[PDB]
Ligand binder design. Structure first.
Ligand code: ATP
Ligand code: ATP
Ligand code: ATP
Lengths: 530, 530, 530
């Protein structure tokens, strides 16, 4: 690659070595395990580049990582792409067969794997063909990664290549029959970092990430680049605490002891942290979790705002950066009380710098932002995957009409607030309308005798795709289908016929099929019952 | 231009229509003249695009602007580049012959000119060949720009082109025999905006620009893109106040009445504002001027910090964005008293996100950042001009060794603070060393009987390029050359022989040649005396 | 595609419409189901092209077929490639998960499927994404293919395209973790047809295919193009009988009634046909089966030659045409008695026209054709797959050293006879030598008390990869491991130490893991026991 120095390329090494701030005595902390400064972190990154080069890793190669959140994962975020290789982030919560599929599909050359994921490997290792080396990672001195790093020099000259070289890849299960692979370039990751820093860095006084913060992730580093936050923290040169495996007591201790002020997580882990007993005597009033990944419920938001936590939501997916929108509150909206707060903070948010985000219908017509007209969200941004790796027909559907299709159904306010209402697939196509299964499920779950409910589409010749319910009861709880029907038929203010209560078809089921991720399997649910 | 929607191009229209924040009721204020909201501003930008298209302006064309800071200049910053044309910003403080040269060199098609610069035009209009239309701008209803805009529609579909299309150009006098033309692309301006927003937006608590600020420029909009601040303010959607022609009373009233909180200026105007009588009864403790363009003196910095002004310096040039470095203070450095503050705040600063900035010697060897070793600053950044327009030999010297040569001589601290010490040309090459003329000039001007001094290089056969002084005395003030020599020879702690006092050669001169910009002409000074 | 008529392209349509012989009253017979002449067959091929075009099938598309051997499969062999589409032949003996994988990997647009394979589909249909139409095939009038064909015209102008356009694809399980996809072009299939017709057509008086023969396949049409024989039969214009689903009574009746004279099959089906009772009163002395796919055993060859059957073997794989070599006997070798005959006829054969076929060692050195030195067979021919579809690392290993690696271990005679001795993977790497597991297995199975044996590689620190046995006993049969050891240790004339009897390690096991194809799983066998 011959480059003229005038033609600036946006590479991840510029992110590491041309930061917003660099303090060589700031520290990276791994749990109660290890602790070292930013000068050691830079040295270790160069050593890791030396070690990878010694193993025969080249510019086009793929190195796969399977570990928890640690300093080693942070070093892989930089060293692998800076040598020109491609970081394949393995989703360890998939089943072994899916994991084997993604390793075969990506064609990894080396696998870095934690010792306590060696049992998943034991049952798929006979079928792996492309992998020449396995490096076992441990939390003590017996780590093979530490031994590899120790015998290398702290010197390395990182190459210059085109900014459009692929940097990372990971696989998303979604709604297809096999996992799909997304990928991003150096330019896209660099631009995601600066775009989000421009958006949440400039907020007047709520929900801002700045150079005085202390960062600790609580959302996996293999999911969406950990929302890109490990890159933005490094760019800001702030203290970074890595908890390892998520255990609520350990997490609460790390927050108290290392004085964490910025995190991301998902509603389940936040509920676990707040409902822990050890959390009752803890000061939380300097902490700023952003909750992405699932809809933040208003009840959880309210419970968190009474502990003085600056909780807010964000939106994104595997195909999109991940960040597309965040909730940011004006000085007047900060004057409201906890209920009007909890309403705003639970929204999907407003779109970030350099994002388009229209709501459209099935034929790609743009719907008004009136506050109630719903449609599918389609986006244009500087950091979207152009297609699925090694895939054509699914890629065409991803980018239909010149926009990226998120698969989520929402309405937008006239002031720009986005409220996701359901999924495109999950929408019931009764008669001629589209009711959301989410609101009906939420109504039914409000019952004092219900633990879970799913809503699916059964058919009808007269009203087409019509609603149906599965309900699961609690300890020694028995409420019939007809009673549930009446309870639902109570409510008012809905569409269709009357307010949609003649097709509820509620059924009580011991269990609802759930994936390995813990999300109810709507595909198998509609396979079994019909 | 055919683009696939996947391939995202970084254009200025995305800056206008994909902001960090958009409030359609936020306002743009022109002095006491006009006031309208952001919704009117977007409408006017589309109208201006319609009007330019009607005049035959095409993608490659050049529109030249000659006005003060106003809303019209802000509209030209967006409309001209968004149609694909090139905005040539005319430096109205140059002499008429230089202005004529730059108009001929750039080959402008249309000229927008304020009525009170029509006398400069009257004497160069006979020699302009390429210009087909002159639009006269006025501060009342008789403006030709307002009439052109009124008869257009508020609708316009802005094209998509390559991100490497040139957006702006302007000319810098510098050290050559004619002005040199620099140019920037859409990608470079967009990246300058996000890089600076990432740097100064994320500061913990001092010197930050955010979405709650009110912006008013006090540095010309034709100089360096006004430090890029008009783009960053628009991106943040904050209130923007344009003062027009700089008069200190009007400026102080605008600060008081519109509640301005962020500005940029140069030391002379700041001294005028602080030394005004009307400024004695004014609250200044929410104002954050950044002083670039010349070295901020410690005495001015101290006088400003006792009025509670958040004053800080920044560094950049016509060839470089303009921003390369800014002073940003840590929470501990904010605990210091006004003297240790005034020391830090007057430094050139630390480099911003995505900037390299080495100090080097004459043969391109990198000098240590020990705190006192000086050398020329050379930089790499995403927003540097690749060459001078229509120029080859000077362009080769600009990028010698694969780095951009700034022409400034500085040392860097081990913590990253840059202190500019002099110019490369102005360095005295006595014997084998390089003394700075700036420190000697500063010493000599400390005298209670001196109004100004210049230091230049006279020659010597024995000590080569040796120092020489020109001094100008005050009202009825007479101090001989020998007395000045003794006064200088007093001081201690310097290099060369003894502490360099045998070649001072001080001469008293009624005047020192000054350019139209007001900067002492070192070239003519060394032409006259030798 | 613009072609000059001078530049002749080798396309499959030339095979159909420029044959060696065309008799429009010759007939295609499907079992006891249907019967029509070659003029109807050409008309139906044009109708099928019309129907496929009406469904939106284009030049690059993929149509997948899942049926038994019938006239419809023969029509798919021509119509799909002649329109420029790609025929994906689905292996219905794979498990449903593998079938689903190959459908996803190939990205089929339409699926033609027989009604009695609809239960495999029912359990993978929820996970198929790319398929827009399913055409159900039946053996009566209710076939959807017949209905589609009836409403089309018998006219169609077939395009001219490049001869290097892909025509067919199918997937082979082999030794990797997922099935691999091979593909062939029009040129390759045409050249395979003429090369084999040149080889076996010109034989003096044994084992020749000519224009007076009657052809009936007994090896699946989805396996290797049915050894390319359906193309060669059509080219010769001979009568073609398709039996449908292989049932020995039906097959014997078809041979007797339609007077079949040329077939291909595998040893198991031939053993079933010869050992049937209905076969005892059948004249077989005009029939010429070629046995490929597995090694033809000498005992089966001898039993077939006493019924006066012209039995001979052939060699090929999914990656190679399939044909690479056939046994062809000289007039002197036809004078030998049934034992010396059965020896020659069971060999792998000699290579066919335009085939290279060297035996090599692990470092790609060419071994002598002395008659006993063994090595891996590597080939060059006009009809080999250049790589695996969507695959890089496995493709590199397929073509290592500039030759295609078959994975089989054989020695070659000085007269050119090839005798395959084992697989490359199955070779035991004891000490420094390579014994074949096949000869040891054959010895052990000779025991009067054994039903099956497998030999695998257990390890040893002293002799490296050393032999091990699994044995299964017959009805109420019990012979210990030590007795088996002694029985084996009897024999003489072998290598290593003594004659290799100290590491036999025989174990009696109720069952030996078998794949869905019925081939013993050596991979799982070495996974379980070690
Ligand atoms: N703030 C939010 N509110 C509501 N839904 C959200 C929010 N953030 C993310 N989501 C949902 O999670 C999706 C993120 O995409 P992702 O890559 O994680 O797919 P996925 O986790 O693999 O889905 P699945 O488990 O079904 O296979 C979004 O498309 C959206 O459906
Ligand atoms: N904070 C600062 N401290 C010291 N010098 C500075 C600072 N900022 C800018 N400068 C000086 O002003 C220069 C900016 O470049 P610029 O485009 O303005 O050239 P110029 O104004 O046309 O020079 P001239 O008047 O001599 O022709 C810098 O190279 C540097 O010399
Ligand atoms: N005449 C023959 N003698 C011995 N072995 C043969 C003969 N013909 C074919 N074979 C074997 O069958 C192989 C043909 O390749 P093929 O495409 O059928 O792989 P496969 O059937 O899918 O193997 P597997 O079941 O293990 O997955 C040859 O490589 C060879 O091992």
């Amino acid at each position: 690659y011959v480059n003229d120095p005038s033609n600036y390329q946006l590479l991840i090494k510029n992110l590491l070595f041309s930061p917003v701030a660099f303090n060589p005595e700031q520290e990276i902390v791994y749990a109660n395990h290890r602790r070292h400064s930013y000068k050691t972190f830079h040295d270790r990154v160069r050593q890791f580049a030396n070690a990878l080069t010694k193993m025969g890793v080249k510019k086009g190669d793929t190195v796969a990582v399977m570990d928890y959140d640690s300093h080693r994962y942070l070093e892989c975020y930089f060293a692998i792409p800076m040598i020109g290789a491609k970081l394949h982030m393995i989703n360890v919560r998939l089943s072994p067969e899916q994991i084997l599929y993604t390793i075969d599909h990506a064609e990894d050359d080396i696998i870095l794997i934690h010792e306590e994921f060696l049992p998943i490997l034991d049952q798929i290792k006979g079928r792996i063909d492309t992998v020449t080396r396995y490096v076992v990672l441990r939390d003590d001195e017996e780590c093979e990664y530490e031994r590899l790093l120790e015998q290398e020099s702290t010197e390395y000259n990182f190459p210059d290549f085109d900014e459009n070289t692929v940097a990372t890849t990971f696989y998303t299960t979604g709604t297809t029959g096999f996992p799909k692979g997304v990928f991003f370039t150096h330019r896209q990751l660099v631009l995601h970092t600066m775009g989000i820093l421009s958006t949440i860095g400039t907020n007047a006084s709520q929900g801002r990430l700045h150079q005085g913060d202390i960062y600790m992730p609580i959302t996996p580093m293999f999911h969406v680049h950990a929302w890109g936050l490990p890159y933005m923290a490094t760019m800001l040169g702030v203290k970074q605490v890595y908890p390892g495996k998520y255990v609520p007591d350990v997490l609460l201790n790390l927050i108290e002891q290392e004085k964490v002020t910025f995190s991301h997580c998902v509603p389940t882990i936040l509920h676990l942290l707040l409902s822990s007993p050890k959390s009752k005597a803890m000061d939380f009033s300097g902490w700023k979790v952003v909750i992405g990944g699932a809809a933040l419920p208003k009840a959880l938001c309210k419970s968190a705002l009474e502990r003085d936590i600056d909780v807010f939501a964000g939106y994104g997916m595997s195909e999109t950066g991940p960040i597309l929108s965040i909730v940011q509150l004006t000085p007047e909206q900060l004057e409201l009380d906890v209920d009007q707060q909890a309403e705003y903070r639970s929204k999907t948010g407003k779109k970030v710098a350099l994002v388009e985000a229209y709501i459209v219908d099935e034929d790609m017509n743009k719907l008004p932002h009136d506050g109630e007209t719903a449609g599918e969200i389609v986006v244009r941004a500087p950091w979207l995957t152009p297609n699925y790796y090694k895939d054509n027909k699914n890629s065409k559907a991803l980018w239909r009409g010149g926009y990226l299709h998120t698969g989520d159904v929402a309405h937008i306010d006239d002031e720009g607030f986005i409220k996701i209402t359901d999924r495109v697939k999950d929408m019931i196509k009764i008669s001629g309308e589209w009711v959301s299964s989410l609101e009906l499920e939420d109504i039914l779950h409000q019952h004092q005798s219900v633990s879970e409910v799913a809503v699916i589409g059964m058919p009808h010749n007269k009203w087409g795709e019509v609603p149906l319910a599965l309900v699961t009861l609690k300890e020694d709880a028995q409420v019939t289908e007809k009673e549930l029907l009446g309870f639902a038929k109570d409510f008012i203010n809905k569409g269709i016929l009357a307010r949609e209560a003649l097709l509820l078809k509620v059924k009580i089921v011991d269990e609802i099929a759930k994936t390995s991720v813990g999300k109810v399997d709507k595909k198998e649910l509609r396979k079994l019952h019909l």
